């Protein structure tokens, strides 16, 4: 059920999303900007291992289209994106190091939810 | 709606929870074993800042009582526990360093969901 705080909480989520896409974090956010193109990257097992792909452009479209009804739904998608990276790649891969840094940006600001 | 995979996914979640409570991680998991006793710790603003307290003993009771119906519900509570730590404490506090390490244990194993 919708709560009167959901619009303002979704604004905070949109602020976080804007930050994740901003130049400040681009050195480690770039692998998450668009859907993984498994074929182009030679990752021919990606869709056998990752059942629910997610990326920041998809989160942005869902925010713009008012798909997310509350902050928890938004956060589950952002976390799904990171989890897919931790599931598919070896833990010492540079893409995992980038994911951990971007997730730290996300989690610390999500925790500041007004 | 319940899925036939929910029991096995909840078993994986229970395995993670057991690991988080195990001696292997006790050096950094201990602040999360029981509900924050704000009065005992002198944290007299804790319940003004943290609207939804969560801790591993509460997660365990909810698992034992079949409160969680799926893995996503379990994961939201574990993540809520970490988020409360990131929201209340300064980011350089030792309890935050412990939270980050325990959350890394959680997220990497949650990502291995069968
Ligand atoms: C930097 C390696 C190519 N690459 C780009 N994006 C990626 C990857 C990858 O190997 N694994 C991933 O999960 N993603 C998101
Ligand atoms: C180690 C400091 C006391 N202490 C114990 N548990 C805590 C804290 C704290 O200051 N902040 C917390 O969030 N928790 C979970």
Curated annotation (Swiss-Prot), chains A, B:
Changing residue 36 to A: Abolished binding to histone H4 acetylated at 'Lys-12' (H4K12ac). Changing residue 41 to A: Reduced binding to histone H4 acetylated at 'Lys-12' (H4K12ac). It is found in: Nucleus; Chromosome. Residues 8-113 form the Bromo domain. Some specific inhibitors of BRD2 that prevent binding to acetylated histone are promising therapeutic molecules for the treatment of cancers or inflammatory diseases. ABBV-744, a small molecule, has been tested on tumors with success: ABBV-744 antiproliferative activity is mainly restricted to cell lines of acute myeloid leukaemia and prostate cancer and is able to displace BRD4 from chromatin. GSK046 (iBET-BD2), which specifically inhibits the second bromo domain, is a promising therapeutic small molecule for the treatment of inflammatory and autoimmune diseases. Belongs to the BET family. Homodimer. Interacts with E2F1. Interacts with (acetylated) STAT3; promoting STAT3 recruitment to chromatin. Interacts with CTCF; promoting BRD2 recruitment to chromatin. (Microbial infection) Interacts with herpes virus 8 protein LANA1. Chromatin reader protein that specifically recognizes and binds histone H4 acetylated at 'Lys-5' and 'Lys-12' (H4K5ac and H4K12ac, respectively), thereby controlling gene expression and remodeling chromatin structures. Recruits transcription factors and coactivators to target gene sites, and activates RNA polymerase II machinery for transcriptional elongation. The first bromo domain specifically recognizes histone H4 acetylated at 'Lys-12' (H4K12ac). It also specifically binds histone H4 acetyl-methylated at 'Lys-5' and 'Lys-12' (H4K5acme and H4K12acme, respectively). The second bromo domain recognizes and binds histone H4 acetylated at 'Lys-5' and 'Lys-12' (H4K5ac and H4K12ac, respectively). This is Bromodomain-containing protein 2. It comes from Homo sapiens (Human).
